[PDB]
Structure formats: C-alpha cells, structure tokens
C-alpha cells in the first residue's frame, strides 16, 4: 500500500564520501545498489524519500530529506545520479530510484537542500552491464533483431518485493544539555528525551520537560531524543533499538523485474569472395562484434574471435561444410564444389592434376 | 492457510478493530498491530485497511 510513507520517514546515515573525499553524515546515504536487470538498468536504494512532501502528501515535485531531527522539503527536479556522465532517472518512489547509466567505477547520488546547499553520497560501484547477444553495441539501433532480456518494470505497483521497517534508535544530540552556574540543564524542545549522568545523584531516566541536574558539568551528562512516532527502514549503518529486532512493519518496494525483449543491431553484411576450399570475408564492425565458425561434421573445430576494427579473414571450408555466424546475424553456410583448373579427358598430366585438386588425399596414395 | 490474529483475540487478518483511521488515531499503533502476523498471507489486507485510513469522505 503506497500510503505507507505516511507512517515511515527518512533519516541521516553515514556516507563514505560526501563529495570532497571525506566521510560524513548525509541524508543522501546510499544503502544498496542492485543490478539484476540484464538490460543494465540500476535499482538504487537511498535514505531520502522522493515523490512525497513533509506533510505526507504524494507531491511528485518533492522529496523530504532530513534536517537534523525532522523531515524538510526539497525539489525532485534537482535530484541527480551519475557514474561517469549523468544518468537518466526512469522511475522514483520513496527510497527507490531507477537509473539508466553509462559505464563507470563509482556511483554518486545527490540533491539540493532547502538551505540551497547541495549534498551527495558517492560509493565505489563497478558498473559495466553484460552484453546481450554477440555485439558490444552502445545504444539501441533504429533497426536490428529482438532478444530476451530483463528490466525493472517502470510501474511502481508495490507487489512481491518487500523490505522491513523498525522503530528508530535513540537520536543522541550534544545540544540537549548545557553548563549553567555549576549545574546541568537539559533542554527539551517538544520531544520525549532519555538521559543519564555519572553525577552524585541517581537522576537518570526519561523526560518530556526541560530539567536541572545538580552540581555536575555538562560532559557528566548524556542525552538523546528517544521516542519516535515515525517508523524507519532497519538499515545497517543505523544502530538497532534493542537486540530483539522489534517494533516491526513492512513496505513493498517498487519496480519488479519483468521478462522483456530488447533490440540489438545486426552487423552489416561482410564482403565475401571464394577461393579453392576457402571463404574470404572482409568485415565491417561498427563496435566489437563476435565472429564464430564451426565445421558441420563429426568434430566441430569451433573457433571464435571478437573483432574490433575492419579485418579480412580466410576460413578453410572442409567437405563437411562450414557454418560462420557474424554478430547477431543468422549463420552463413558454405560447402565446397568439386572445382579445379585441371581436366579429365585431356592428356595424362591434366587428368592426374584434376583428380589431385579434387582428391589430394586419395590420388597421392593410388598413383 | 487458516486466518491470522491480533494477539488480543483470534480476530481475522485485516478488519477494522473498532474504527477506521488506525495510525491517524494513535501513531504508535504500528508498534502493537504490525509486529509479527505480517508473516501470515492475509495481513497485506491489514496494510490496505489501516494506511488507506478510510475517514468518512473516503468512499466507494
């Protein structure tokens, strides 16, 4: 049920690289990149929530990050994801982004804060999607064959795939306490707080008012916001509330895999010409293209090479026949004819030459 | 399978307990109501019935 983003909320979490080559706490913290889709689409899970506003309205123009203790609004038209050049985002709902993206060693996701600061999180992520078929083509052609692949289907239709939620941990905050006249004061800005001290009083407990704890300096006290009426994902890199793994719920996660055909090019026709027991082929790869060939007899002698630039090949065609398959084309078949420059019916030196070109195995035995 | 429960009673997976609105009447209801019986197939209709809060103007 898509309305579950009423109950659950975004959060700050640790990030290994916040742009400047330093690890920091970030609202854009990146939880999991997953790339099971064979068309090379990425499903990306992030600690923002997108397509929803702070007031829990499903505002398609908005995302709601996490300003210190609370959600705050930001604009979906300034969300970005990149890995060498920019990606195109192809679906976005709550914690989940779909991206179609170029090859790269790293992945970064980012946005603009309501303060107009821009935040990002960068993870090492080796993205190089597998090739479909037999040509390392870069972008879909406006003419070619169709082959079976898989994609994260752009329908958010929240079904079959699902993730846990938990209550947040306590949220430590060193501003909740201050030194004053040799006492601690605890300040409690309209949220339930938990606190502890090493001081000469057994004062430790829970409060919803501000409080004074006698005689101790501020570092003798520790305090955190403790109650949280908004649920959260149970990510690693945010601490558990208690060892039981409790106050649970679940969320269905968008964009399931679908079996779907994708278009792939057919390499342009080779220029071919024939020799005695040979096919000669001049090949025009636009991109790295696979050539395979096999004998069609008892031992296939299968061979292949990936060709990257214009090349001429000379394939020996046996009496058993040769099958050559070039890129995503249907295979070419070749069989030798009994051609020779010699002749039967001529003088003996012609007839032995005729049979020697047709039967070089048998003639050198029988003569 | 046979039906889910609320642990208060062997009440079926998804139905309103006394009223609609659930989380919008008290937000810590998820704490009680959604802990474990979500491991029984019918409880996905509880997420339909609770979070599509169904106050008077939400209608068919």
């Amino acid at each position, epitope marked *: 049920n898509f309305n579950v983003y009423k109950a659950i909320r975004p959060y700050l979490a640790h990030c290994p690289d916040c742009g400047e080559g330093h690890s920091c706490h970030s609202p854009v913290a990146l939880e999991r990149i997953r790339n099971e889709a064979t068309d090379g689409t990425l499903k990306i899970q992030v600690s923002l929530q997108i397509g929803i506003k702070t*007031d829990d*309205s*499903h505002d*398609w*123009t908005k995302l709601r990050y996490m300003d210190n203790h609370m959600p705050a609004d930001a604009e979906r038209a300034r969300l970005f994801v990149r890995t060498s050049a920019p990606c195109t985002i*192809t679906g*976005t*709902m709550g914690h989940f982004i779909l991206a179609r993206c170029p090859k790269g060693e790293t992945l970064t996701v980012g946005f603009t804060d309501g303060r107009k600061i821009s935040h990002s999180c960068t993870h090492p992520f080796h993205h190089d999607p597998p090739v479909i078929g037999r040509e390392k083509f870069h972008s879909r052609p406006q003419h070619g064959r169709e082959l079976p692949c898989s994609t994260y289907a752009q*329908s958010t239709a929240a*079904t079959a795939e699902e993730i846990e939620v938990h209550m947040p941990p306590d949220t430590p905050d060193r501003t909740l306490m201050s030194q004053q006249s040799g006492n601690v004061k605890i300040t409690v800005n309209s949220q339930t707080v938990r606190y502890k001290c090493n001081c000469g009083d057994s004062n430790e407990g829970l409060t919803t008012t501000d409080k004074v704890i006698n005689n101790c300096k501020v570092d003798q006290c520790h305090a955190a916001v403790t109650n949280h009426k908004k649920w959260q994902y149970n990510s690693p890199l945010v601490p558990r509330n208690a060892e039981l793994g409790d106050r649970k719920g679940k969320v269905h996660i968008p964009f399931p895999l679908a079996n779907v055909t994708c278009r792939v090019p057919k390499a342009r026709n080779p220029t071919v010409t024939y020799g005695k027991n040979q096919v000669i082929m001049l090949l025009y790869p636009d991109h790295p293209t696979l050539l395979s060939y096999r004998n069609m007899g008892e031992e296939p002698n299968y061979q292949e090479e990936w060709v990257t630039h214009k090349k001429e090949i000379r394939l020996t065609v046996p009496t058993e026949g040769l099958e050559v398959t070039w890129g995503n084309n249907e295979p070419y078949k070749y069989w030798p004819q009994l051609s020779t420059n010699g002749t039967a019916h001529g003088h003996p030196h012609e007839i032995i030459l005729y049979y020697y070109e047709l039967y070089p195995t048998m003639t050198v035995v029988v003569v | 399978p046979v039906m889910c429960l609320l642990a208060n009673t062997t009440f079926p997976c998804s139905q309103p307990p006394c009223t609609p609105c659930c989380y919008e009447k008290e937000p810590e209801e998820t704490l009680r109501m959604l802990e474990d019986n979500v491991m029984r197939p019918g409880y996905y209709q509880l997420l339909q019935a609770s979070l599509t809060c169904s106050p008077h103007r939400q209608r068919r």
Partner: antibody, heavy 127, light 107 residues
Framework: EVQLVQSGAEVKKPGSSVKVSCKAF????????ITWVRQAPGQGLEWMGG????????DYAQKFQGRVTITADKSTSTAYMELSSLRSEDTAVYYC????????????????????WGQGTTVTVSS | EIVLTQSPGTLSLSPGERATLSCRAS?????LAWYQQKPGQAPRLLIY???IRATGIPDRFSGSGSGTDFTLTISRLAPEDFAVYYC?????????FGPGTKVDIKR
C-alpha cells in the same frame, strides 16, 4: 483516494477567460497530479493539453501551445486552472476528475492507488 | 504513435449476463485504465490491465492480456447497464486515447 468537487456549469463571452476550479481531499492533503479529460458530441475523447502533473509547470507540449493559452495552478489542497482567450471550439463538458496519471516520457513514475473518479463541469461560450 | 485500437465498434447483449471487450497495441508496459461512461454522466474506473490489477466499480469484472492484446470482461447486467466503454494510458509521449465501444442490452 483523491476526492474532488468543482463548480457547476457557467456562461462566458467569446475571447473571455475562465478560472475553472476543483477542491480536493480523499487523503491528498496538498496538490497531487490531479488530472483532466474534456469532451463534446462526436467520435472520441481528449486529454486537455494544460494538465497532467499541473504543478512543476503548466502542461503545454508539442500541441495546444498556440491560439489558446491556459494555466494550471499550485493551490493548497486544490487544483485551480485558468483557460483564457477561449472561443467556440473550447465549448465542452470538462472532467477535472482523475487522480494521478503516469505520463511516460518524463524522468519519473506514479502509484496505482484507488483511482476513483471526480465529477464534471461545463463552459457555455455565448453572447 | 501506436493508437489504442478497441476491436468491437458496438456489442449488443442481454439484461443479466456477461461479455468481453478487447483492445490491441504493439506495446504498453504500464497500467491500462478501463472506464465506463453513460450519456449525461462523468466517466468511472472499472479496472487496470497490461500491468497488474486494481478495481473501481463493485466487483463483477475481470481483465487480462498477452502479446498485443489487453481485455475487459463485464458481468451481472441485470440493471439497464448500457454505456460507452473505454481504455486509456496518459501523455508525455504522443499516444492519446481509445476510440470507445458502445454496449447495450436486448430491446
């Protein structure tokens, strides 16, 4: 859910302007891709080329940008609109009565929801 | 592009039973929304197809599809359930709306 209420039918002079309106609830809480179809006697139906998401910008496109001009508005819990310079060809029955579309070709996608309908409105372009 | 091609131009029935409407396209990959309209009334949701199901009007319907085909089945036509029926799937890229099929019951 997305529940809608418009004004009733109205009369406008040729070349005039009309602030068509639609207050919203059924959840929603603020403006949420509330959307349109508008119709006259004939052989089909039409998506109005000023409204799909309504509030990133007004939904002009490859078409409808031309001799008639419109605004779709970012009002609180409401989908206001204004259709302007309107002529005889704009005389129709209107249905600001869809919840979200999912307009494939933009960088984003929507829920499936309960997807129930609103109710209609009319403008009678006349002297 | 494509055009949501409903197959029947009109289908005439009997006041109590069932029928199947069909729509053809080369692709969709998104939810296809089915509507009913009577004259002098606003449209209303039957169902989603081509993606996966949700249903509007009280449950007496089904929908399904494969390859090129997306479809709707009506049932329990005991009231005067004459209407025009439609399928549709939104803008941004140019594809629009179905032509509409009129449905009626024996006179």
């Amino acid at each position: 859910e997305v529940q809608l209420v418009q004004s009733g039918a109205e009369v406008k002079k040729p070349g005039s302007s009309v602030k068509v309106s639609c207050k919203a609830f059924g959840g929603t809480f603020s403006s949420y891709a509330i959307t349109w179809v508008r119709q006259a006697p004939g052989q089909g139906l039409e998506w109005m080329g000023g409204i799909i998401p309504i509030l990133g910008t007004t939904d002009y496109a490859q078409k409808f940008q031309g001799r008639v001009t419109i605004t779709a508005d970012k009002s609180t819990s409401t989908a206001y609109m204004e259709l302007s310079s309107l002529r005889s060809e704009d005389t129709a029955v209107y249905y600001c009565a869809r919840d979200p579309p999912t307009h494939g070709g933009d960088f984003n996608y929507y829920y499936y929801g309960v997807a129930v309908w609103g109710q209609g409105t009319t403008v009678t372009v006349s002297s | 592009e494509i055009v949501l091609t409903q197959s029947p131009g009109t289908l005439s029935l009997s006041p109590g039973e069932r029928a199947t409407l069909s729509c053809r396209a080369s692709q969709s990959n998104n939810y296809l929304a089915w509507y009913q309209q009577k004259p002098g009334q606003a449209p209303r949701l039957l169902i989603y197809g081509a993606s996966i199901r949700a249903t509007g009007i009280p449950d007496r319907f089904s929908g399904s599809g494969s390859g090129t085909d997306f479809t709707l089945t009506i049932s329990r036509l005991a009231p005067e359930d004459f209407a025009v029926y439609y399928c549709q799937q939104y803008g941004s890229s140019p594809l629009t709306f179905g032509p509409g099929t009129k449905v009626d019951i024996k006179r």
